[PDB]
A = this chain, B = another copy of it.
């Protein structure tokens, strides 16, 4: 069952990003805090939509896609990925990682249903690395 993040925590994090900036160690610590439980693509996408401005959000979408593509290359380079399965029918496509696959587009409940925990942690680590890249790039 999907539970959304508190809008109070999200508002506090957005104001933190607004006053301290993207690169302050306190901001990265707060992001790591709100990045503790494995989030669904819907959660991370809406979170970055709210806390980041338009141009940093575009940059972050780009960087997140690139990092997810590196993850999928490593996944096709190793059939023992915690997102993959043993047979070929469990291979994870980027539509399933970005939340674009069938039964997931716009629906967080179905998303949480079909996604694997390894998928969730890989998406989360990818999003964190992308946030770091964009923060280092913006300023």
Interface residues, chain A, CB within 8 Å of chain B?
4, 7-8, 10-12, 14, 16, 25-26, 29-30, 33, 36, 46, 49-50
Write the nearest CB–CB distance from A43 to chain B, whole angstroms: 11
Do most interface residues of chain A lie in helix, strand or loop, or is the interface mixed?
A: helix
Write the nearest CB–CB distance from A19 to chain B, whole angstroms: 10
Q: How many copies does the complex hold?
A: 10
Partner of A4, one of B12, B33, B49: B33
Are B33 and A50 neighbours in the complex by a CB distance under 8 Å? no
Are A25 and B50 neighbours in the complex by a CB distance under 8 Å? yes
Are B49 and A25 neighbours in the complex by a CB distance under 8 Å? yes
Are A16 and B25 neighbours in the complex by a CB distance under 8 Å? no
Query: Which residues does chain B contribute within 8 Å of A11, judged by CB atoms?
Result: 12, 16, 26, 30
